[PDB]
Design a protein around this ligand. Structure first.
Ligand SMILES: [Mg+2]
Ligand SMILES: [Mg+2]
Ligand SMILES: [Mg+2]
Ligand SMILES: [Mg+2]
Ligand SMILES: [Mg+2]
Ligand SMILES: [Mg+2]
Ligand SMILES: [Mg+2]
Ligand SMILES: [Mg+2]
Ligand SMILES: [Mg+2]
Ligand SMILES: [Mg+2]
Ligand SMILES: [Mg+2]
Ligand SMILES: [Mg+2]
Ligand SMILES: [Mg+2]
Ligand SMILES: [Mg+2]
Ligand SMILES: [Mg+2]
Lengths: 97, 122, 206, 179, 149, 51, 32, 144
RNA sequence: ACCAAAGCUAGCUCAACAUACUAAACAAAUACAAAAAUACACCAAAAUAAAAUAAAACAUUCACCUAACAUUAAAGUAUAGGAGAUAGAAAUUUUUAUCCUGACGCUAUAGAGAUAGUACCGUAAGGGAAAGAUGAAAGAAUAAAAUAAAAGUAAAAAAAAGCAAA
């Protein structure tokens, strides 16, 4: 439980940088823009997670279906094993049934 | 157990394991079991005469160097054949079919020191 | 020959293969990495042998001559300006020769000074119309000559005497190459008169 | 002439022995092949003498007098060898057009890699060679999987190296806000 | 030469000639009492007895009579700081017996200088005198001698 | 089972590291007083009178 | 600061390269 | 006052050790009270070394003056002498300056004491001077 | 007071883009008992995935399980199933070009096993680690400052009687 004996360097974080000032600026692009673009298109990230949300099993299933043809050998094997384990646990284990 | 990182030399085996250390062979085995050495297989050092040679292993420190201009095939051709080709073309006797008189070797199988097969060590 | 260094290597104004550096950092050490500002060879304007001024430190405003530069840590050192005093002659029952050694300084703390007004200036690289790249000051607008410095060997070409195993300049610069289409082997054989009639047989390569 | 392995007897006990600078490529190229051939042995004798001196210094547990002479001689011999190799390469390019002085081929061994198999010199053709015939230059169908693992491993190494370099650049920019 | 491809020899082939040899040898002082006519060399591992005989007879013009070679194995017991064995390279040792009755004795390549010994003795005496004069006076009992009074 | 101690403080400088310094030592003084003054034997009885 | 240009959906027709092997087939079908 | 930086500025590298080495772990109370005879320059000497092209000039000054020196121990007890005694001392202070150096501060370099100078004041404590330590195979020799 | 304790870095992780994918070294030697220059050959081979598990047993069955078609729906629908557990489409529809890419991921028992597939352990296939911390300068070790905070000891062995406390 030994704790450090010196003051850590105080992080000089500013609230008025470019990212913090323009955070989510076009969140209402559709509503205020005569609908052409959903707020889905502003999400940057993995291809299988743009404008989508699910639990671990659904996320693994979607990843395997979408980008499973470009995964490495061990990555695909790990994804398959994780899918199998999640299927078994979710469909056969738990309390509330 | 035995080692695996160590080199597998001739000192690490039985009597029947007699591996060479990298020296080139110099003959064959004769009739009664002896080794017959071939004179032509032994290298002959072509050592020049250094008695009257006026150069030393080190250069003068104040001697200037030169800009690095590695010799290329284009420069070698310009130095050895371009003047002859130009003079012959001006004279009008140039023969494109025959180029052996200019140092060109159509086939390397004839001469002693071949270039592509590299018949000479050094 | 060159020495190899681990990526986690700290430079301490000592030769990497020197005994002092070896005793300071054994081969089994890997210290914390210090942040070094990336400055390229085309933007490093601090050379060895030029006069510079000191910005911050105990000797604020003093000028000195650069004696060494270390590009790995962006260090520049001047002779006898930023000094701490250390004893070099240490024995069991005797001490002495307390000499002032000098600490290294950064490029942000050392800036070049032009020889005209002897005042601090900012150096920017410019391309001259003559095909040369010479440092040009911006505060005044003048070029700074390259600070020629003697090499570490310790010999100057102006005073050199040839030994028994040195070639003369004329012999070294004499050109005797005749660019023909013969190999060194063929030329040596012809020169020494070695006659070989028989030729090699057919040799298969695979 | 067995004394040629040693320096002059008047320089034996001297602490420092001075010598000239090393030979350079331009100076070597300026010379003819006769002078190059002679200078090779001129440097060979000096290199043997310097090696003898270094070994004797190690044996006697004393520093070698000015050991830069061996480095200078090695550099000069390397420059001479480079010059001769350049001349031979230029001549063989002019005469045959082959870039490499030894025959070779881009083969694919049983491990799936692409290698540059150099050719050895034999007295019999390839189809009659006991030792050469049992070699295998091709990959079996079970090697594609390992080739894919090699590709993926190299890709992972390169990707994490790129990420490391990007993180280092960002950290340096944050640490030195000179913009 | 070494690290080069020797041309294949077949019946009637030309004699193999090497123009610029790649072999570098060292002359070493024997660690064991050898006869007067024996000279000890450390030679590259690719050199043979005939190669060394030609090397000595042609480059140096030495009338050699016999050559006997052996391979000395370098120790591989010393461990690095990573517990990895460090191997000293193996080397070939050759003994050359001269022919015409010439006797070779390895010279003293580091003769001690009387002037150098005298200078070293003078420096040692000066250092001892400096240490003696810097030694504190026992009668002072640790009180510094720099102050006047 | 084979861990060892470290940090054996030793000072051993040789002529090669003592002469292989790239930059030289920039002294600010000298070893001693060259041409050391020898005061005259009589000073105690001459310090009494100013002139 | 000044905000980046708004994301706008281009009204001009889009035609993927038929020679690209990586383009999806639904963008090359006649229904597209 | 134990001001090492200003002491380095004032005295030179040949004067700092001889005055700090054996005093770092003691307490000194040095005061200046009077100077009967003003310091007088005795001689000036110059040494030029052509290896580096550097010239050093030292000036010797004879000084007869009065201080009050009291050197204390690390435990706070008196060691050398009382604080109110104004003893007279005659010394020869030799200063050195590097003329080639653009800055060139005048720094104290050496302190010459005459061989015939009276012995310094005795210390307060007693001192034991042991004889030569003898191995069993050595017999003591009495000097006469 | 010893033993000790605290650094912030090495580097890792997850995605996007991407040239389009077995890196650099390959002088000589390397499938003779690998790193041994050199002799009349022989070379090549395919034939289903199984089971652990679920059906509370276990026999028919048991999604993913190293084979491309992605997304919004039709739809968990039609169907297939000891018609049980469970499995499960299709016809037909939607998907506007590029930058805006970094981190409400870890900081040396964490993050890759990794300082390294190295020491070491096995005949072999194979398994597989721990270990870094001063400072602008150690070319400032008669070296300078912060904690003297875990368990274990010493400073300082114990005096009838008892879950050690109230
Ligand atoms: Mg083993
Ligand atoms: Mg054996
Ligand atoms: Mg045996
Ligand atoms: Mg024989
Ligand atoms: Mg033998
Ligand atoms: Mg069951
Ligand atoms: Mg159950
Ligand atoms: Mg059962
Ligand atoms: Mg059961
Ligand atoms: Mg199954
Ligand atoms: Mg049925
Ligand atoms: Mg049932
Ligand atoms: Mg770890
Ligand atoms: Mg405790
Ligand atoms: Mg009780």
């Amino acid at each position: 439980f030994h704790v450090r004996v010196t003051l850590p360097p105080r992080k000089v974080v500013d609230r008025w940088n470019e990212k913090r000032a323009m955070f989510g600026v076009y969140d209402n692009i559709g509503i205020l823009g005569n609908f052409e673009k959903h707020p889905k298109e502003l999400i940057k990230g993995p291809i299988w997670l743009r404008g989508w949300k699910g639990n671990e099993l659904q996320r693994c299933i979607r990843k395997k279906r979408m980008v499973g043809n470009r995964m490495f050998i061990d990555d695909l094997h790990n994804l398959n094993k994780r899918i199998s384990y999640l299927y078994k646990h979710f469909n056969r284990h738990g309390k509330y049934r | 157990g035995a080692d695996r990182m160590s080199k597998w030399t001739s000192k690490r085996g039985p009597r029947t394991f007699c591996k060479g250390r990298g020296a080139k062979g110099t003959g064959f085995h004769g009739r009664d079991g002896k080794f017959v050495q071939i004179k032509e297989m032994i290298p002959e050092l072509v050592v020049p005469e250094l008695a009257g040679f006026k150069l030393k292993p080190y250069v003068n420190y104040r001697a200037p160097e030169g800009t690095d201009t590695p010799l290329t095939a284009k420069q070698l051709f310009l130095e050895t054949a371009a003047p002859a080709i130009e003079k012959d073309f001006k004279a009008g006797t140039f023969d494109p079919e025959h180029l052996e008189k200019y140092g060109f070797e159509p086939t390397q199988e004839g001469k002693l020191f071949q270039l592509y097969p590299k018949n000479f060590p050094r | 020959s060159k020495v190899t260094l681990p990526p986690n290597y700290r430079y301490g104004m000592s030769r990497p293969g020197s005994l002092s550096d070896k005793r300071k950092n054994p081969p089994g050490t890997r210290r914390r990495r210090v942040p070094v500002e990336p400055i390229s060879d085309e933007d490093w304007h601090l050379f060895c042998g030029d006069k510079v001024e000191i910005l911050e430190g105990k000797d604020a405003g003093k000028q000195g001559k650069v004696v060494q530069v270390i590009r790995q840590r962006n260090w520049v050192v001047v002779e006898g300006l930023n000094t701490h005093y250390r004893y070099v002659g240490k024995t069991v029952d005797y001490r002495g020769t307390m000499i002032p050694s000098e600490a290294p300084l950064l490029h942000n703390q050392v800036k070049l000074v032009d020889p005209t007004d002897r005042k601090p200036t900012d150096v920017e690289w410019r391309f001259t119309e003559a095909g040369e790249r010479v440092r040009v000051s911006t505060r005044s607008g003048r070029i700074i000559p390259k600070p020629e410095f003697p090499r570490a060997d310790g010999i100057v070409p102006e005073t050199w005497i040839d030994g028994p195993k040195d070639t003369s300049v004329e012999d070294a610069l004499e050109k005797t190459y005749v660019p023909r289409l013969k190999t060194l082997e063929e030329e040596v054989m012809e020169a020494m008169g070695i006659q070989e009639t028989r030729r090699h047989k057919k040799v298969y390569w695979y | 002439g067995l004394e040629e392995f040693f320096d002059d007897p008047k320089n034996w006990g001297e602490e420092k022995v001075k010598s000239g600078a090393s030979w350079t490529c331009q100076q070597l190229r300026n010379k003819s092949n006769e002078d190059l051939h002679k200078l090779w042995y001129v440097l060979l004798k000096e290199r043997n003498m310097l090696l003898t001196l270094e070994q004797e210094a190690k044996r006697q547990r004393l520093p070698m007098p000015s050991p830069e002479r061996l480095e200078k001689v090695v550099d000069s011999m390397d420059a001479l060898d480079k010059v001769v190799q350049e001349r031979e390469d230029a001549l063989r390019l002019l005469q045959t057009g082959q870039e490499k002085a030894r025959p070779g081929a881009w083969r694919r061994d049983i491990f799936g890699r692409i290698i540059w198999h150099k050719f050895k010199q034999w007295p019999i053709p390839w189809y009659l060679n006991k030792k050469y015939n049992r070699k295998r230059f091709f990959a079996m169908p079970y090697v594609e999987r390992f080739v894919r693992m090699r590709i993926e491993k190299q890709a992972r190494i390169k990707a994490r190296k790129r990420s490391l370099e990007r993180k280092k650049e960002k950290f340096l920019q944050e640490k030195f806000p000179h913009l | 030469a070494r690290n080069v491809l020797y041309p294949l020899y077949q019946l009637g082939n030309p004699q193999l000639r090497v123009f610029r040899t790649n072999f570098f040898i060292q002359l070493v002082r024997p660690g064991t009492a050898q006869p007067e006519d024996t000279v000890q060399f450390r030679i590259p591992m690719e050199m043979t007895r005939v190669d060394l005989r030609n090397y000595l007879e042609r480059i140096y013009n030495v009338p050699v009579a016999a050559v006997r070679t052996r391979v000395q194995y370098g120790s591989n017991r010393r461990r690095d700081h990573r517990n990895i064995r460090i191997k000293k390279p193996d080397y070939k040792v050759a003994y050359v017996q001269l022919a015409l009755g010439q006797t070779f004795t390895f010279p003293d390549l580091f003769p001690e200088r009387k002037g150098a010994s005298v200078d070293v003795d003078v420096r040692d005496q000066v250092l001892e005198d400096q240490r003696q004069k810097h030694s504190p006076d026992p009668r002072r009992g640790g009180v510094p001698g720099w102050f006047g009074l | 089972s084979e861990k060892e101690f470290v940090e054996h403080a030793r000072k051993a400088g040789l002529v090669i590291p003592h002469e292989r310094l790239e930059r030289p030592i920039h002294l600010a003084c000298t070893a001693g007083i060259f041409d050391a003054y020898v005061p005259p034997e009589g000073d105690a009885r001459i310090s009494s009178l100013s002139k | 600061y000044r905000a980046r240009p708004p994301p706008r959906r281009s009204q001009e027709p889009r035609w993927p390269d038929p020679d690209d092997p990586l383009t999806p087939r639904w963008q090359l079908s006649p229904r597209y | 006052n134990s001001d090492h930086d200003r002491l380095h500025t004032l005295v030179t590298e040949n004067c700092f050790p001889d005055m700090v080495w054996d005093i770092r772990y003691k307490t000194v109370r040095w005061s200046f009270v009077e100077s009967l005879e003003p310091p007088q320059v005795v001689q000036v000497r110059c040494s030029s070394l052509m290896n580096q092209g550097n010239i050093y000039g030292q000036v010797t000054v004879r000084m007869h003056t009065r201080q009050t020196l009291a050197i204390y121990d690390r435990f706070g007890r008196l060691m050398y002498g009382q604080e109110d005694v104004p003893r007279d001392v005659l010394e020869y202070v030799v200063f050195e300056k590097h003329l080639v150096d653009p800055y060139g501060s005048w720094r104290m370099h050496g302190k010459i004491i005459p061989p015939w100078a009276p012995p310094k004041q005795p210390i307060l404590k007693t001192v034991m001077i042991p004889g030569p330590q003898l191995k069993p195979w050595e017999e003591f020799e009495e000097p006469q």
